[PDB]
Scaffold this active site. Structure first.
Site, PDB file in Angstrom:
ATOM      1  N   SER A  49       0.827  -1.202   0.000  1.00  0.00           N
ATOM      2  CA  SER A  49       0.000   0.000   0.000  1.00  0.00           C
ATOM      3  C   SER A  49       0.864   1.256   0.000  1.00  0.00           C
ATOM      4  O   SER A  49       0.358   2.373  -0.115  1.00  0.00           O
ATOM      5  CB  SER A  49      -0.936   0.006   1.210  1.00  0.00           C
ATOM      6  N   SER A  98       4.696   0.394  -0.353  1.00  0.00           N
ATOM      7  CA  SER A  98       5.996  -0.178  -0.686  1.00  0.00           C
ATOM      8  C   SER A  98       5.900  -1.164  -1.847  1.00  0.00           C
ATOM      9  O   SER A  98       4.807  -1.540  -2.268  1.00  0.00           O
ATOM     10  CB  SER A  98       6.603  -0.869   0.537  1.00  0.00           C
ATOM     11  N   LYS A 115      13.381  -2.960  -1.535  1.00  0.00           N
ATOM     12  CA  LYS A 115      12.064  -2.483  -1.137  1.00  0.00           C
ATOM     13  C   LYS A 115      11.903  -1.011  -1.505  1.00  0.00           C
ATOM     14  O   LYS A 115      12.498  -0.137  -0.875  1.00  0.00           O
ATOM     15  CB  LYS A 115      11.861  -2.682   0.367  1.00  0.00           C
ATOM     16  N   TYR A 153      17.267 -11.650   0.425  1.00  0.00           N
ATOM     17  CA  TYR A 153      16.304 -12.340  -0.423  1.00  0.00           C
ATOM     18  C   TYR A 153      16.039 -13.760   0.065  1.00  0.00           C
ATOM     19  O   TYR A 153      16.926 -14.615   0.040  1.00  0.00           O
ATOM     20  CB  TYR A 153      16.773 -12.361  -1.878  1.00  0.00           C
ATOM     21  N   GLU A 156       7.240 -17.636   2.141  1.00  0.00           N
ATOM     22  CA  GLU A 156       6.804 -17.490   3.527  1.00  0.00           C
ATOM     23  C   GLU A 156       6.708 -18.831   4.251  1.00  0.00           C
ATOM     24  O   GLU A 156       6.699 -19.890   3.623  1.00  0.00           O
ATOM     25  CB  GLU A 156       5.443 -16.794   3.578  1.00  0.00           C
ATOM     26  N   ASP A 182       4.096  -7.368  16.017  1.00  0.00           N
ATOM     27  CA  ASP A 182       3.332  -7.962  14.925  1.00  0.00           C
ATOM     28  C   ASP A 182       4.046  -9.188  14.359  1.00  0.00           C
ATOM     29  O   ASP A 182       4.812  -9.086  13.401  1.00  0.00           O
ATOM     30  CB  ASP A 182       3.090  -6.933  13.817  1.00  0.00           C
ATOM     31  N   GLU A 220       2.985 -14.735   7.932  1.00  0.00           N
ATOM     32  CA  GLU A 220       3.084 -13.911   6.733  1.00  0.00           C
ATOM     33  C   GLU A 220       4.439 -13.210   6.632  1.00  0.00           C
ATOM     34  O   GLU A 220       4.976 -13.041   5.536  1.00  0.00           O
ATOM     35  CB  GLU A 220       1.952 -12.879   6.692  1.00  0.00           C
TER      36      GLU A 220
END
Length: 291
Positions: free
Chosen positions: A18, A20, A37, A88, A93, A132, A136
């Site tokens: 949203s 990046s 990024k 990388y 995930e 957090d 993910e």
């Protein structure tokens, strides 16, 4: 000569955001693959996510080049964008690894679990509380080893030479992006979190690694928050008791009564793991992946 941006080969997009955008980059000389990024400055100004960017950058400056986390090699920028050259992770995930065979076996869960616990331990040692935590943002490198990204919601501590930064996390807000299933009860309630929050999330993660689904998985978010605040989770019929006890002492409402990191290290499930032999935690041949 020296190394610069022109030595790179940008390839596929590894996933937009949203504000990046991660783009795969490759050093033409060494062949080392990175993850650049790209963040649009106006997008982070309009929503005031500069604090998120600075918390992430600060956490990356704290957490140097270790095996448990994504590391920030160098940075560059133009006039409209800012670029983060990171690590990388080739094997995507952890959530995809879990969803590969729906569930995981006990051995792999102990392996990657010890890895994750080691990572969190390192973060807490360097004064970083991710808050957090979820499958993910837990990736897997080329040699199949876990890493942790998305240090935007992180918390800083020691104030040794760099000060502390703790900003509220309103889960019920609109600025919050995610599923909020791996969110600590205290973090959900009083918008603040401590070290046992990442432990809570860890418990949710290993529970998901065995069962295949999050402990507080619900249809909406009302029943989700209800499950979190009422501790409404039930182990499956065929569930390892050894792990069940660990989950029972990890997933606790009161953070004070919650099991700390060394206590998890000295558990009957992690007696088969020496957390000082970190060659066995990371360089070990990953067990045969399967349910």
């Amino acid at each position: 000569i020296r190394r610069n941006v022109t030595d790179f080969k940008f390839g596929k997009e590894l996933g937009e955001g949203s504000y990046s955008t991660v783009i795969l980059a490759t050093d033409k000389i060494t062949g080392k693959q990175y993850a650049v990024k790209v963040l649009d400055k106006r997008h982070i100004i309009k929503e005031k996510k500069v604090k998120y960017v600075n918390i992430e950058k600060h956490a990356l400056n704290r957490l140097s080049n270790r095996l448990g986390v994504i590391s920030l090699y160098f940075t560059f920028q133009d006039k409209d964008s800012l670029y983060f050259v990171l690590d990388y992770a080739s094997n995507g995930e952890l959530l995809t690894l879990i969803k590969r065979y729906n569930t995981l076996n006990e051995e792999c869960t102990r392996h990657f679990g010890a890895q994750i616990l080691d990572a969190i331990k390192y973060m807490h040692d360097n004064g970083v509380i991710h808050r957090d935590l979820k499958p993910e943002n837990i990736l897997l490198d080329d040699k199949m080893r876990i890493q942790i990204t998305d240090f935007g919601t992180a918390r800083l501590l020691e104030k040794k030479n760099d000060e502390s930064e703790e900003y509220p996390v309103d889960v019920r807000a609109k600025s919050f992006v995610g599923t909020a299933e791996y969110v600590s009860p205290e973090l959900l309630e009083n918008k603040y979190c401590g070290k046992p929050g990442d432990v809570w999330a860890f418990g949710c993660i290993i529970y998901q690694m065995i069962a295949g689904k999050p402990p507080f998985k619900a249809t909406n978010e009302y029943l989700t928050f209800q499950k979190i605040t009422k501790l409404q989770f039930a182990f499956s019929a065929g569930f390892p008791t050894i792990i069940r006890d660990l989950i029972k002492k990890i997933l606790v409402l009161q953070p004070s009564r919650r099991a700390t990191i060394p206590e998890i290290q000295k558990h009957y499930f992690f007696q088969s793991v020496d957390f000082k032999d970190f060659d066995s935690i990371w360089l070990s041949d990953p067990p045969e992946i399967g349910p």
